[PDB]
């Protein structure tokens, strides 16, 4: 089952390789192995983000 998560708050990337998203955005999970930095896809973009900025959606 393809897992998703929804953005709780906006997240403006500080370093390269980080996924930018607005609150309410639904992100697709690629990697959830590291408890802090998860990797996902948002349309065209792909990158890591703070897990404490999202919660499950689907």
């Amino acid at each position: 089952e393809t897992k998703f998560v929804q953005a709780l708050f906006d997240f403006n990337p500080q370093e390269s390789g980080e996924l930018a998203f607005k609150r309410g955005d639904v992100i697709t999970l690629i990697n959830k192995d590291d408890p802090n930095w998860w990797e996902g896809q948002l349309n065209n973009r792909r990158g890591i983000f703070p897990s404490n900025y999202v919660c499950p959606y689907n």
């Binding site: 708050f9 703070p50 900025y53």
Partner: peptide, 7 residues
């Protein structure tokens, strides 16, 4: 909005 942890 919680603080972003160690990179």
């Amino acid at each position: 909005p919680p603080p972003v942890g160690p990179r």
